[PDB]
């Protein structure tokens, strides 16, 4: 049918499973410490999540 070819691709690994949680892009993702958000959106919210550019 049509249901067998819509989401039949395995997406439990790789870079296609993960995307940004704001922009939903597949580049520049910060998977470190489980942010699961790109580097670009990391900047304008860096004070909001809490990083401070101290040194």
């Amino acid at each position: 049918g049509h249901q067998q070819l819509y989401w039949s691709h395995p997406r439990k690994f790789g870079q296609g499973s993960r995307s940004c949680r704001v922009c939903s892009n597949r580049h520049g993702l910060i998977r470190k410490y489980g942010l699961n958000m790109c580097r670009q959106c990391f900047r304008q919210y860096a004070k909001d999540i809490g990083f401070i550019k101290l040194d």
Partner: protein
Amino acid sequence: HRIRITLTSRNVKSLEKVCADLIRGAKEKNLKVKGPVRMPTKTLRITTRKTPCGEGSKTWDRFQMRIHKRLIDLHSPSEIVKQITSISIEPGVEVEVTIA
């Protein structure tokens, strides 16, 4: 009776004011107090490129979170601990109390 209280806070002086406040609260009830053990901190290094695109000079960020943890040991049952720990607490400090 051997109760552990965990003091984690992002601000340095928010953790430092409450780590001595529990000393002041517990010394009024005059029981066995261990000193606050200063354990080494964890810092969060994130280095990303500043340019949203890939054009221009190569410059990098230094985004940091230092997190501090303080452990104070108490020799008391949980009745005394549950009274003081509800007094003068601020959301910058996350307090974890272990009865064992």
